[PDB]
Amino acid sequence: SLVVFPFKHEHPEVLLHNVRVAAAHPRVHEVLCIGYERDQTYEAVERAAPEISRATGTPVSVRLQERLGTLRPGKGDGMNTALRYFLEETQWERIHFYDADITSFGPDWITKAEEAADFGYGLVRHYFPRASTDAMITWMITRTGFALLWPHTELSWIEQPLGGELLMRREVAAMLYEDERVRRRSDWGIDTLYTFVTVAAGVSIYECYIPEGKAHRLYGGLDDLRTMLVECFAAIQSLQHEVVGQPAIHRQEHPHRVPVHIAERVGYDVEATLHRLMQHWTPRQVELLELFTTPVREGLRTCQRRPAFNFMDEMAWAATYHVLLEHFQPGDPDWEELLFKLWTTRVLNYTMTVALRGYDYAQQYLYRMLGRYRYQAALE
Ligand SMILES: Nc1nc2c(ncn2[C@@H]2O[C@H](COP(=O)(O)OP(=O)(O)O)[C@@H](O)[C@H]2O)c(=O)[nH]1
Ligand SMILES: [Mn+2]
Numbered sequence: 127s128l129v130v131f132p133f134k135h136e137h138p139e140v141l142l143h144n145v146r147v148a149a150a151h152p153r154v155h156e157v158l159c160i161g162y163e164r165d166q167t168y169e170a171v172e173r174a175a176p177e178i179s180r181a182t183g184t185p186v187s188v189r190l191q192e193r194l195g196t197l198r199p200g201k202g203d204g205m206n207t208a209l210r211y212f213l214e215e216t217q218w219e220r221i222h223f224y225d226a227d228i229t230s231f232g233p234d235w236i237t238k239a240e241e242a243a244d245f246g247y248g249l250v251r252h253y254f255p256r257a258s259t260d261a262m263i264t265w266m267i268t269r270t271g272f273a274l275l276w277p278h279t280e281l282s283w284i285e286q287p288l289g290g291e292l293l294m295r296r297e298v299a300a301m302l303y304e305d306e307r308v309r310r311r312s313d314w315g316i317d318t319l320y321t322f323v324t325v326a327a328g329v330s331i332y333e334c335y336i337p338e339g340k341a342h343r344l345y346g347g348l349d350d351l352r353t354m355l356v357e358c359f360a361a362i363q364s365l366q367h368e369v370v371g372q373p374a375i376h377r378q379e380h381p382h383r384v385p386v387h388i389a390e391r392v393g394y395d396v397e398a399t400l401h402r403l404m405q406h407w408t409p410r411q412v413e414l415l416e417l418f419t420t421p422v423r424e425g426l427r428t429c430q431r432r433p434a435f436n437f438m439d440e441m442a443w444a445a446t447y448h449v450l451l452e453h454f455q456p457g458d459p460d461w462e463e464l465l466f467k468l469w470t471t472r473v474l475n476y477t478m479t480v481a482l483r484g485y486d487y488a489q490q491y492l493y494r495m496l497g498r499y500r501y502q503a504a505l506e
Contacts, residue, residue: 127240127293128218129154132191132204133226134162138170144224144231145171149184151236155218157186158211159226160204164190187211195312198357202316209303213296221299225290230341238334239293248298248329248374251284252291254340255384258481258488259393262473263351263358264288265492266443268318271362273496274447277504280325280373282496285333287321288358291340298329307364314354315361322361326370333378339388347398348473352466359465360456389485396477400433403470410460411467417453419445426467435474440495443472444502 129148133141141159148157161168168188175186189211191204205223212221220243224231235252242250264286273282281287294302302308302323311319324331345351407430415423422445425437438446446468455461481488 127154127220127222127236128212128216129157129222129224129236130160130205130208130212131157131224131226132160132201132208132290133167134201134204135165136167136226138167140229141167141226142171142174144226144228145174145186146178147231147233148222148224148236149178149182149186151233153236153240154184154222156216157184158208159186159188160191160208160211161188162191162200162204193312195310197311197315197360198313198353200313200316200357202312202314202319205316205320206303206309206312209299213300213303219296220293221296222293223290225340225342227342228291228340230338232338235291235336238336242332242334243293243295245332246330247332248295249324249331250293251286251289251331251333252336253285253289253333253378253381254336255381255388256339257388257391257393258485259473259477260391261286262393262469262476263355265495266469266472266476267355267359268362269496270443270447270499271359271451272322273499274444274503275362275366276370277500279370280331280376281322281370282500283376284321284325284331285378288317290317291336292320294324298324301327301329307368311361313360314357315364318358318361318365322365322368325373325376326368328371328374330374331376335379335381337382337385339385345394347395347402348470349402349466352462355469356456356462356465359450359454363451363454363456366451384485394473396474399470399474403429403433403435403467403474404431406463408460408463411464414453414460414464418449422446422468425471426464429467429471433474435471435478438468438471438475439479440498443475444499446472 148154171188179185191207194206239250268287269282308319421437428434480491
């Protein structure tokens with residue numbers, strides 16, 4: 127198999143460790159690191175490369191991402207450049223992706239995936255336990271969107287649609303490299319694209335569970351995620367009129383109980399997030415609210431004077447979602463900030479009226495949210 131780690135600003139030690147793990151694995155026949163730019167990490171890898179290759183019998187290659195798409199040049203270009211290398215410069219039967227910044231990586235990751243592929247699945251997705259205030263894009267944007275737009279489909283049932291850890295059969299990779307909507311998505315929307323398209327094409331999917339969780343880079347306040355938020359919402363938006371094919375087999379490994387350290391983690395700085403809600407206002411944003419339902423309009427307007435979020439419950443979010451699908455303009459600075467504030471109030475609502483009632487309570491809620499969304503959408 128080919129194992130790929132795409133990287134941007136990672137520390138060298140962290141990535142080289144993971145490369146060492148993959149290179150040591152009996153089933154891995156090459157590893158490719160795909161860099162955003164040539165930096166300290168890129169060079170570090172390049173010189174450790176031929177030395178790891180002889181100690182293991184596995185070639186390791188570094189390469190720059192190239193401009194294959196047309197949105198922000200970001201992770202998409204990275205993964206697609208990797209697709210091209212896999213498909214055009216090698217004859218390997220399978221391709222693995224794993225985020226570069228993982229600190230809990232081990233060979234069972236690889237093993238579990240390969241075995242599932244042996245079992246016959248076209249695509250294998252690693253999923254993990256996550257803290258109840260993490261994954262807020264995943265739930266509030268990606269899964270919610272898939273549920274509101276494609277209720278009868280397998281799409282909202284994917285556990286981790288933004289997740290970067292996965293394995294594909296060659297033909298699946300080829301199919302994806304050849305799909306214009308996929309190639310286009312050079313920014314953060316790549317994972318959403320791979321998820322959507324593999325499902326839509328009737329690829330057979332297995333989601334295997336990694337109990338240890340994903341130890342990666344940590345994040346402080348909510349606006350760390352702002353670009354990602356817009357790009358991820360954009361991705362859904364652009365798919366909104368697509369149609370989905372007959373589904374294949376979709377099965378998911380049963381999840382273990384959550385590590386205590388994970389159930390006990392807090393995803394963001396509440397104070398700072400409340401502060402941020404009252405910032406970066408413009409008259410244009412205030413006028414743009416006129417597009418929204420009264421409680422959302424009035425809700426968000428209050429945020430100019432003081433933080434408000436009780437209004438942003440599950441129904442209000444769905445209504446807000448429909449307006450955004452219709453009027454949101456990627457590239458528009460005001461729409462971008464409005465989406466951010468708006469998502470922000472949803473997260474806070476969820477944090478105080480759900481996450482605070484406890485981990486299990488939150489998880490049960492989130493799944494029931496999707497359920498209710500799926501059911502509402504299929505009546506209209
Ligand atoms: N090649 C490439 N890799 C990227 C880019 N942006 C992010 N990455 C990598 O994609 C993976 C996910 O990035 P990260 O910020 O840690 O994702 P997150 O944990 O979900 O917030 C990591 O391996 C990053 O190094 C990019 O523009 N190009
Ligand atoms: Mn990460």
